[model samples]
Target: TVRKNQATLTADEKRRFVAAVLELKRSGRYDEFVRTHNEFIMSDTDSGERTGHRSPSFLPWHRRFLLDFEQALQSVDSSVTLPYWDWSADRTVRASLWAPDFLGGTGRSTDGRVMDGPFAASTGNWPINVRVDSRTYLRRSLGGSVAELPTRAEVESVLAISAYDLPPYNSASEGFRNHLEGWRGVNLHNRVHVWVGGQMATGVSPNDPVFWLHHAYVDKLWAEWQRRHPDSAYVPTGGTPDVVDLNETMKPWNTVRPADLLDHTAYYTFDALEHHHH
Candidate 1:
């Protein structure tokens, strides 16, 4: 019913989360996610029919995509909910999210191969199946490609944007979506992917379980943006050629529209959103 910060998960919560993820990989359902993301990321271009990564649909597309993953994890263990990593806060290699018992540390110098986490190549639990390149191991270079994750101040700057998205409605367009997508401003989502490197830096990012946690936080930021600017809403109301309009259905599953997903409480809430304080 709720998604919590990764730093706050109990040992049992972490255990169940890990076990469920491993089971999904073993059951052959996990790799399909990588392929799906690749298919969309590779094709969702600014010059064409963009849906997943670079358009207004980016938010809804990922929300549904993450929900699908969360549902998959739930089937393996109903108690498990996706945990978010606040990179703005947990901006170090030593963060609890990277502990050996969890996602492990950065990849070694030679090949960017992760060495300790359950998803590490050595674990025999996670094998990179879907690929554009040949590496068959989970890898990361946390804060390597990029020196730092976005800070809380930077995040707040993005949240403060009143426009949900702007006229162009793509990466080059100015507003919350493009800024938070990291094509401009402080560089939020795309920067984190670059910071992680490896398959994560690729179109096939879900290969690393951290992909979910990172995006969960990104997803949280979108909700926070909505809360801060209650009047500001999604744009491109009608007659946009390539972008998904506010009322139009998103791709991969044309049943749901961005209008349907604007309110996340319909599915689940963020634990951090339960109460506000100074």
Candidate 2:
């Protein structure tokens, strides 16, 4: 059971949060996060070990991944929690969350240089080392193209999907993961990236603070799925390569399996989660 975020966080809390993330980066765990994502981003395709990204396990797989990251954050600062981004509602650049005091505003149109945020292109602190794309540096354009982010109603629809994933669970799959990934379907996650444009949509998505918030919401949707379909769980329980399977231990940690990571309660409870069992 997840709950709403403690939005009213203090400045000290924010500092702690940033410190934890920075510590993770300093300890080399931060890069591991990028590496794990890159591995899955490429592996969770139409083919190969498609346990995540395009399979029924997409929701849970990411659920576990987010949990891992959240746990890391907590290890550094227990008071800090991951925030979520409702792109549909916060569609415009005017969204208060984008202010420098919060997630920061968008970047310039000419070069997608983020003018604000912890990883503002100008800071030179945030670099896009891990990527599936050609460029390896930070990039962003904010509202250079779009006007509004996705609304909550739109997110509800994506969470309602019960079958776990679209179909085929490969580049050929014409459903859930494909749709969510924006390769096909309603374009939940993928569309947001495209909508965000710049680096937020590219391999260096993490460069934007919105990346964390956006994923927080995505993680919430996975929790919603669990409440909706308790019978459904992490897939590819055994015999998988490249892609991490249910019983198999995930990389970096190499200690916990997707099964152990499924229950957020095992680590930290979510702010809130909603579900409608039919």
Candidate 3:
């Protein structure tokens, strides 16, 4: 499967993607994902045994997570593959990613509840089952929590870092993983969540469909970083405490290791990184 950029998706592609996601929500499968993400975020601390977030395994763990999600979506619609949202370019409420047929626009005022789109509460298709609050409606104040998304220059700088992860391989690490994860440097991932607000800004972020796309782009950055620095690879190769070693098996999926996931092309390919004129 070729994961295309969200901006390049055709109308038909958008429809299929939305349909597959809605089908998962209808089947009660989608909520489980939200719960799992929340569980991991709550447990994957910066100090202790971290697997899902923080530490050296962050990229590999989420790569595996997105793979599982994409597989689930494919089960409903074979043609549907997760799209990547390059927030650096598509940095506005007006982006096609937020169109009514796609993921929809930001939430309205007052309580920050999204009033349109397929996943809106009134749609009956999306109920926000696994939630952190009493309101089970999707909410997003696009550019609310943050004024803007990361610029391409910021992303390039992070990607240019030669080290996959440095010592104490956690949020404190001064490496590409921590910077891209947004715990340290210019704040990429976490800032996007804050910018998206509501459920997306919370640990139950997987509740928002855009969560997958955002992470897809992050995963792509890992692939790009690999290309830019062939010699610099995942650190803590062995005998690392609290962090998943380069070859150690990641939890929740005991079979796959970081070394196994370093190759992004093993499961699917990404579209060439060139923007076309509209």
Candidate 4:
């Protein structure tokens, strides 16, 4: 089952995981994650070249991105793998991931100057070295910029949708993928960016550590969606021009394809997952 990725890791694994991530920074690859993320964040808009963020490609795109990130971590320390966050279960600031050792606590408002966490500006160990904005340091105030973590009910609402993404694929379409991606109708993903507020709400979101945790949870939801809709499967399967077809291999790494990622178990399972049994 799918649950928080970090929650699944043991103490040693967590330590290794953190160390590996920091190493990516030391080796100069981690900065590219920030750079690549920013490029996609801006590219994946309501308009042109929207592969990952705003199209049916969202799931497959992220599936690839996360895999790439995980592989990068693995290169640094094979003992470390990418862990996820289940925000629905751990919505408050007190989740273990927020402790000073990990990501740290929420901002004290007034510009989200996070004072704790490995990435906190105060720590000086994990600075926002790569960024598009002028200011370079970790910053976030949860709920500061109309950004609020989605409730469990909201997760349920998206899970209940049975269909995969449909035609006329834009930010306004209905169906499981679009709604979960937060592109169609109520504007899910964009709203989440808005919900987190501050620098996270902008394009260079990786500046905030919550960016990884938030997406970890979002990735969990995708796995959960699979459990409930076992037969629902991934969409935009074949012959799509720009969008990545189901089995098509993604860029930056040509070997792993969406077909390879269809089963989360092939890589890593969730700490817990609620099966959407028939």
Note each model's CA RMSD in angstroms: 1.4, 3.6, 2.8, 2.7
Task: Score residue 12 of candidate 3 by CA lDDT.
Answer: 92
Residue pair clashes in candidate 3? none
TM-score order, best first, reads 1, 3, 4, 2
The deviation in Å at residue 61 for candidate 3 is 0.3
Off by over 4 Å in 1: 274-278
Per-candidate local distance difference test: 0.90, 0.63, 0.90, 0.71
- TM-score, candidate 1, is 0.97
lDDT of 1 by residue, 80-159 (tens): 99999999999998999999999888999999999997988898999899987788998888888889889999998898
Candidate 4 residue 64 C-alpha distance from true site, Å: 1.6
**How does candidate 3 score on lDDT?**
0.90
| lDDT for model 1 | 0.90
Going through the candidates in order, what is the number of backbone clashes in each?
A: 0, 21, 0, 13
Positional deviation of 111 in candidate 4, in angstroms?
3.9
The per-residue C-alpha lDDT of model 1 at residue 251 equals 83
Overall local distance difference test of candidate 2: 0.63
TM-score of each: 0.97, 0.78, 0.97, 0.87
lDDT of 2 by residue, 1-278 (tens): 23234254456655666667767766777777776666666655555555556654565666667777777888877777776766666667776666665655666766666677665646655666666666544566665555545666766676566555433455556544444555665567767777777766755566455666777767666677678778766555665554556677654456666777677676556655555456
TM-score winner, 2 or 4: 4
lDDT of 4 by residue, 49-117 (tens): 566676776776677677678788888877666677666666666678777777777676666678876
